[PDB]
Structure formats: C-alpha cells, structure tokens
Design a binder for these strands. Sequence first.
RNA 1: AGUGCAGAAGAGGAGAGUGGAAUUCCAUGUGUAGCGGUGAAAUGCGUAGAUAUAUGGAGGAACACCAGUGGCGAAGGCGGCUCUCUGGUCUGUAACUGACGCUGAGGCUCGAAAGCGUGGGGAGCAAACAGGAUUAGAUACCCUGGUAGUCCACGCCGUAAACGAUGAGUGCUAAGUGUUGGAGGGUUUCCGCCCUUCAGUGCUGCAGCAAACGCAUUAAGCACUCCGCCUGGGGAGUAC
RNA 2: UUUUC
Lengths: 88, 66, 117, 275, 97
Amino acid sequence: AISQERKNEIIKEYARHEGDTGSPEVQIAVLTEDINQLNEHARTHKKDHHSYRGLMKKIGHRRNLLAYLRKTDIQRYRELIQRLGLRR
Amino acid sequence: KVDYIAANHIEYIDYKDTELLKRFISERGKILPRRVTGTGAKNQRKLTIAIKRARIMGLLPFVSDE
Amino acid sequence: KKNIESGVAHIHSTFNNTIVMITDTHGNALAWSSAGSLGFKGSKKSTPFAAQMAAEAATKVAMEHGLKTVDVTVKGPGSGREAAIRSLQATGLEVTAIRDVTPVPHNGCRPPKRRRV
Amino acid sequence: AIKKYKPTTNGRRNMTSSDFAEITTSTPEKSLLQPLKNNAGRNNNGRITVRHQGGGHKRQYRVIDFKRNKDNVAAVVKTIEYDPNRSANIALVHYEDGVKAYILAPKGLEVGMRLVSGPEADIKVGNALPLENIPVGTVIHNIEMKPGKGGQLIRSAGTSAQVLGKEGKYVLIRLNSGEVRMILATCRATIGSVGNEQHELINIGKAGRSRWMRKRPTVRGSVMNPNDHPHGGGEGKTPIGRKAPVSPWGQPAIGYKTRNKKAKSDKLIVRRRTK
Amino acid sequence: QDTKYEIMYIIRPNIDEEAKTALVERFDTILKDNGAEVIESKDWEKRRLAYEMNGFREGIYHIVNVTSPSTAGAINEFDRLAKINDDIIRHMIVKVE
RNA sequence: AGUGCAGAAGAGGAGAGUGGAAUUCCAUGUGUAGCGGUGAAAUGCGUAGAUAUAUGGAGGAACACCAGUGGCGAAGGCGGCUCUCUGGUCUGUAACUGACGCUGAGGCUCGAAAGCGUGGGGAGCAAACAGGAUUAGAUACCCUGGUAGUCCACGCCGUAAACGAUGAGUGCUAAGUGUUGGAGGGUUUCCGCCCUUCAGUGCUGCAGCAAACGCAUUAAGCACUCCGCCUGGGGAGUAC
RNA sequence: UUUUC
C-alpha cells in the first residue's frame, strides 16, 4: 500500500510526543490511510480476494483498537473521530 | 558435501555467461538436476529461470535433433 | 535412374504394423514397403522378422535406381524397428548415421480414455 | 448500458433500451444538415419494390466523411451524437484550418483527442492511413473498395476486420462473416472498431416501437389466398404442400446461393465462409 | 526510487549502418521524452541465432539501460513501437538488481 | 498482544503482452495398394491417390526437463516467460503503546468438479446418440465415428471421501536422525566443517495412554477457557 | 489380457 515517506510523515503530526510509534492514535491513523489506499485497490481490481482479506483484517484491528480507546479516555476518542473523519 | 559452483563469490548470475551456463544442460539440451550437479536449492532455481529467459532470445536452443 | 547415390530412409513401427520408405536427400519418395505390403495380416506385422523382409524388399527396388549410402529416420516406438535397421544393413547398404526422432510434446493435448481391459 | 423498465403495463414487461450515456450533446450544426424524403419503397414509376417500408418519424442528413483527404493537419473531436440513419455514434471535428465535418466514431474516442490522417500518421484509434502503411494484425474500418470513393466496407456498430497478410499486390483482409478478400493497396482505412456494441441486446417490446422505426407488418405466406402467394389456400391450417418452400416470386427460400456465377471477382474471393 | 532495466533487442543483418544509428537515436528519443533517465548504452555483438526466427539466422545485438519511476509510462511507448517494426525482431525488458 | 528500526524467502492474487514443441485442417512437390484397429476381427478410410514424406499457412488448448517426504495460501487450490497494482509469513532488537486477549449462537465473506442465463470461441477430449464386435441375451467393457460440455467475460447454485474422517487459544513432559528459510561463537580463504539458537516440514522411538490397532513436542499424554455435535439398526436426511 | 464355473 503506502510508502515509507508518508509513513514517516503521518506518524509525526499525530504523535503525542517524541517517538510514539505505539500510541493507538498513530496506529489507527496509519490503518485509516492504508485501508483507503487498499479500498482504491479493491475498486481497481474488483475480483481479487487475497488482498480484500487484508482489508478485513485491518478494519477489524482498527475497530478493536478504537473500541479499546473508547473505554478509557472519551475525550481523545472524540478528538480522533473529529480528526480522522469516521464513525457512522 | 558435493561441490556447488558458488565457490566463487558471484551473486548475480549475469544472465548471459555461457561459460557459467553450459555445465547444467545436457548434450542434447535439457536441464541437469540438482542432485546431479550438487548445488543449493536457490541456485538451482536461479539457473532455471536464467536459462528460461535465455531460451527465448536464441542464446540457446530448445531442441537439438537436426 | 540418375544415380542419386545418397538419401535418407524412414522407419515407422507401431504395436501392430511397421512401414519403411526410402527418399532422396530431401527427399521425394523412391520406393516403400510395409509388413502388410508383403502379404501379411493383422497381428503378425508386430514381428521383427517381417520388418526384416519388408526392409530388404524396399532396398531391392531402392538400389535398382542408384544408391549406396543412406541415413535412417525412425519414428514409431515399437518392436521390430531394430531388425529393420540391421537387415537394412544386410543386403547392401552403407548406413552412416541414425537419427531416432519420435517427437515428444510439451503437454499440450490429452491422450484418450485410458483403457480398461 | 441497458435500461430495464419495471413492468407496469403489459407492453412494458420486457422492454429494454440504452442509456445514451456516451452522447455528450443534443444540438447538431446548421452547416452539415441536409433534407430527406421518405420513400416507402416506391420508384420513379411509383410502385412498391421493397416491401414493408415507410410510416414513421422525420429525419435529416448529417453529411459524414468517408474519404479524409485533408492530410497533415490535426483535428480536435468535441461531440458524440446520433444518426437516426446509422446505428453508430458520430463525432464533430474541428480542423485547425477552420473546417467542420463529422466522423464515424469508433470505440475509445474521448473528447480532446487529435486524429491525424496522412500517409505516414501514427497508429492509434481514429487515424486514417492507406492500406500499404498499416502493419500486420490491426483492426480496421471504412475500407475503400476503389481508391477515391471513400469507404464502403465495414461501417456499422460493433463490427471489425483484420489484416491477414500483404502481398506486392493485393492486400489480404479478413472481413466479418469469416471471409478473406484481395483488396488494392492504395485504399484508405481507419484503425479501431465501431462504437455501440449492443444493438442485438435491445428488446423493442411494443409493436409501436418497431413501428416508429419505419417498418410495417409482414403477413405470413401461408395465410394468403392462393393467387397472391404460392403457399396459400387450404382449408384449416395446412403444411407447405409444395416441395422446397418458396418466396412469393418463385426462387426457393432455403438453399439457393444467388451469387451470379460469372462475377468479376472470383479471382479475389477466398473462402466465403458464412453466407 | 526507480528501477534498473536491460532492454536488449535484435536488429536485422541486411540493413545499412546509417539506419542502425537512426534507429538507435529514434528509440533513445522515445525513451527520453516520457521521463526516463538514460544512463548507458552499448552494442553487444554481431551474433547468429541458435534457431531461425522469421527467415533470419543472424542478428545485431544492442543493449540500452535506463531507470524511471514506475508510475511513468516510459516503457509502454517502447513496447508499442518495437513490436510493430520491420527490423527489431524481439526485445526483452528485465529488472536489473 | 502490538508498532517503529534492519534483513530473508516464496507455483499467494488480479490486469496486460509474448515464446517453443505437439495433434488436426488447408495448399503444393514425390509416391502407389494399402492404411488404421484388436485377444481375434470387423465397422471406417484409399485408384476422385490414402498412409508415408518435405516446405509453408491457419487456428484453439495445455505448459517437457527444471521437480524434490520442495515451497505458498484459512480451506477450495497455485508450476512456460516478462512487466504494472497488491496481501500475508519468518529472523535480530526492545528505545514505543501499557493487558489493548481468546473463543465466538444469529449475521457477513470465500468456496473443486458437475449444472443454469446471455454473448464469444471450438485443436484435441468426449456424457447423450449411431454403427461394428463378444455373449444364451449385452442397450456395457473393446473398436470406428460424434454433439452439448471442457476455454473467455459478466451473473447464478453453495455441494464432495472439502480427509490428518483428528475444532480453535495457551502452558508442561527422554532422545535420535535427515531436510526449507534464517541468526550468533571459534577453526577459519568455513563461502566448502563443527557448536548454540528460531521457526515449518518427515521418520524411528521412552513414560503415559488406549478394545486392540496405534498415538507419542507437528500427542489420540498431563491440564484450563470457549464453540459445535451424539444416544440401537431400519423407516429417512424421507413426509409436512 | 476371449466368455463360463
């Protein structure tokens, strides 16, 4: 999907401080742009299945991290869903 | 323990070295197996794909009867 | 006629027939013989003996037109295809090179129903 | 693509028609229209020759190239329209000299392309080359029969041809319906295949829609009285009592090849495959 | 980044040598138009063929070497034009690492 | 449990183009009484020149050797070549997140072959069907023919001995020997030995089980979590 | 590599 150039780019603006390659804000952001590019891949090659499975696994993982993040700090939850454009 | 050809430190098989290539073919023109030549698994595969590229451009014959 | 003096013969041997034909250096057909052509039938065309007598009956007409040396084309994986060559050596030829070409495909078509007998 | 109307009334159960999605505009020019009559198949003498014609809407000419002789001048393509005459879609063309005329639009034309028509123009969709310069194995239309007319071979929708093999003279061509023909090498062509693909994928549905197109109902032969048609007569329904079923003029219908064959082209025709 | 390429094609024997230079410059121009950093080009040999190809049993071997971004169409304009010629018999494009 | 940093392998998938050999048909040269077939024959083809033989032309399908108890994928499955898009796996490290995990009734997705719709294609192969043989009979095995189908695109059906007949997650319990991809120590030109350590993949074996069969660090052994299923054979995966 | 026990 993505290149390391945008992978270096988007971790820095959404990190809470220096070096936040964990920090589930950054992880759900990277997963969001990955699933957007792979969704373009699915729109292009409409009869692959062996990457659409990867879409399903990434959406499940980001779902589970988001549902974790809801149970601890609701302010950052609203912050991110305003900040990334999701949750319908 | 059978001596593979990779005693020289050649990494890329250079795709055209007929000196490095005729060892693995038959006199009739087939491919000699890996137990016959005694090499590692990946170099067998590299030489296979190398001469499958080399059979199309006329650098090597398919069938040698006539 | 013309003392062609060289050429290539052909051998084709099934499991139930074997057939010989002798050509020019390219070649046009000069004279041919078969195991059935000498007055045989059915099963008995599989023998190496009939291959001998048919190949020699081909050579008899072949060297009545000027012919000393010959090369041997062999198709037809069968039984008597060696006795054809060796009786071809017998009655006065000078076989100098043998090419056994029966062509293998590279898995393009299918064989028929694999028999149940 | 194809619309499927929801079945509301019984003459709308199994209708289909296109989307007209390719078509950009709806306004033809003044300069390229010329009038037309209906004929309903009637001569100078005013008698019916080809049956079952007439009785529909109004139409006009749209004067369309078949020659493309203005060479070494580029050309912009801006619209994709109708003919009611042709099955297909047809395109306007702006020459850079300031000259307009239409062009038969094949597949793959977009607005903004440039079509070049010289004897050495490049090989893409829409160009116009003489048949010498076209290499082996392309897809071709508007083939001139004789050099200078303009095209008469394959024109209509969704069709194609190929180039089998050159000679010194002539050029071989696979047409549609299987054939192979010798054709002179100084004739013009295009490169590509025609637009609409789907005219065999349209239910006409009503009687009235095929009646809008300039048709007319065709009576069965065996229903006529025996003096307008040789199948006719007979009390009850009858089978064809005559050997080899006949058109109403003689000439048995299923079987006659009617190529004359002593035609002047049997040297050129190889393998009439499906006629 | 880019990707490194061998592009080796086979030229007829019976052409004239001025046509060789014109052909080489034509294909180098159709590379250099479409965003393709040419680097290096040599002529390989004057070699015969291990089997007959069209009616020919010899050929002139050239090699050109180029890098380009993968999004650029600097290769398809070679692929369309090489195989519609008269003098280029075959041509092969490999990733070089 | 994850993510960054650094490497490695691979018939994992879609789109596009291209190569050689072979079978059949066409055209032309030579060539004449046979060819093919079987346990044995015969239907069939050949004097309107077959088989055979040499040169080209056409077209569709499958990819010889490489090839292996190899590899890849959750299963179905994936082997000519090249390029474009793209998923997953393993090895060192633990600076980063601080339990974010497992299983999952209904629900959603995928799913060998056969079959259905619409449009293409059709070289071999061959259900239905025709003819020739065997038999007491032969709608079959054997032989000569021969369509739908097998291929492509877009939809449909959702089935198998889909099997390791062994559900998924995790920890513990003698060894021995080959292989696929890695990573460290020294002899070291070690890149050609040996020692240590990760994973998959075979095979022989001890405690332990089991009705024996056999299983046995890749448990059918020792234990927890969660889910599905069984209760004599028929009636039947039938009736409603 | 013919039917039958």
